[PDB]
Amino acid sequence: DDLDEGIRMTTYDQYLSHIRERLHITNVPDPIYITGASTPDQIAASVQATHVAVVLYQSGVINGPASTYLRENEVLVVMPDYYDVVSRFANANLQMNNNRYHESVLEIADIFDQADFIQTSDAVRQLRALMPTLSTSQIRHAIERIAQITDVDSTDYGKLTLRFLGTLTRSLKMQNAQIRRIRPDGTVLRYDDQIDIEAFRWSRYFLDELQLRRLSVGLRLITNPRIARRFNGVRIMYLTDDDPDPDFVPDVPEGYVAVQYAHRLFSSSLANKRNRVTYTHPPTGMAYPSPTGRPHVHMTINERAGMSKLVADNIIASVIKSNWVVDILDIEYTAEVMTPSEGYTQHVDAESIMTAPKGKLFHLQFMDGLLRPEPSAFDPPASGEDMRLIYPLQPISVARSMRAIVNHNEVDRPRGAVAPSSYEMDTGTLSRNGDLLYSPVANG
Amino acid sequence: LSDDFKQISDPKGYLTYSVKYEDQFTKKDKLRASEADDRIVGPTVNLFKYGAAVVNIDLNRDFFDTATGIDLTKGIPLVQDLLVPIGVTAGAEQSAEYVSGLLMVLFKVMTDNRLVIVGETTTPMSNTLSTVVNNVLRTTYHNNVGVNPALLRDFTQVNWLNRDITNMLQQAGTKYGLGLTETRLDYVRLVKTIVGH
Amino acid sequence: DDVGIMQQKKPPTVVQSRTDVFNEQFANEALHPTTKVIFNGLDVNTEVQP
């Protein structure tokens, strides 16, 4: 089974939050619960009823014809939670397993057939995945900020200004809100075309149609790979400066052992009348007081937070002497790509890389050495060796359209030269409706 | 009338090419285009000049201005005091700024109400242009051509580049063209005729 | 491909000066490419050949 193939399913909270209001707004029966006693035909009647292909899971193990109906028709089961999911399904082939799924965003447009009630895409969720979880006051702060940038006087917004109780700030957060009539009891009523006006049907995130039309284009912009210029993780490896390309990530050598960093690995110890910072290799269990002579180690550091200066200096020493490779995933960074003539304007000592606060953006610089002309035949030999510690874990040159606009010889291309992508030049046509398009690839 | 739109000529994009040069490289031979072909092809050619280390595609700093609170000096968008800790000053160079930057990009795009008007144009006679340019040009074109790598064709003295660009443009699937074109909206009126460039 | 003529920009050239005995430490080692070199007087090719 491909990761795409299998039984789709989602948590109830997602269904309430994104699916169910649309069912209510489209005047269709609420999709059937599926118990153990559920023929596929009932599921078909339900899917054709709601025009949506969704069934809430109620209780009990689900019989196999039903399961295969859900698999073959891509029905989205909605489940209370993710505990013991497999026990909720009969396993005729026992292929199913709790650890064996593939989590992925699934746009509402792929479920609903009615475009009128679908304003956004996956990209907003991806952007929210970029955000820190916000306390309600932080949300209010963000809103007041954006307002200040747009020169809006948002004072007293989201607040009661009672004469006797004083000012009282209410929460501004109201994600996926709708305008809905309430019974005098205060409880919410389902939207009704008979009484509530059509405008109240769907809030559309409370934005103008034009702002939505541009919002879509903007979401395509924000989630472009080429804009994604904030990078995570840095490999530290003592290595000669060889590859011209900025985007180089040295591969880990054949003999290395992966080892998660942990405070438990490092300790004080006696060793020849000194209290050395011993590291005990998790496989062999052997203790090595010295940074020299330790086993080759691909150590991964998920978080530097509590790490002592002693241990950090010692890990760096192991990178230099035992030739450790130390990936550091905590770091987020930007990367100006320098060209050899402009040199390395900024500098980063290993101490600062091991001790910079989390959440600060590091600004690393990486030379593209490709435009470095060959040395004079009569320049004196280098007795020494240029070295390097910092490497990216990921490609850096995402923003790069072109490279080495010069000739090797007068006719050859330099190795590593980058031609512009064809799409940079495609200027096709407008679609039948107005939208931009690339030219047809073939005649058909 | 309501000021629903910001009518402007010669529009700026959300993205622009940036370009770093190693100045020690210079082709010895000096290319001499006709003045017309220089008027069109030229802004491209000065940008993607010989000895250019790398061409980048950054967001247009001119469009996402400091007016939006956005910085773009480091390659990413950044906006201060948007997503911040409460009760303490946010640390300098915080990574959260990048996420803030994205919102204010998206916002600044959701609110982009520019309405294009044709700017100054030129209608080169076919003979003035080298054939490779005339095949791209479509009668009239804006005097402020932007840059485009497709315009380097048969002008860049970087042979391999001209070879690769000529290949991509001799493919069926890609056709550079610039200047006035026949839109479905041609001849439609709205006080003035709509046209497409 | 061509040999450079203008003076090229170079990595900073730290000179380690290892002796009989020394306490190597690696705090604040530079991460940028760097030229380790052990001797001071390495401008040794003096005698020019016209």
Binding site: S341 | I8, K12, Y17, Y21, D23, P43, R61, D62 | -
Partner: peptide, 26 residues
């Protein structure tokens, strides 16, 4: 002479639309 490096980025030119008084067609 020392080797050097420089940068460039395409210039903005986005003016407000001109108010012409002439008209091209009858």
């Amino acid at each position: 002479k020392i080797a050097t490096a420089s940068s460039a980025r395409q210039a903005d030119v986005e003016k407000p639309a001109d108010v012409t008084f002439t008209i091209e067609n009858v």
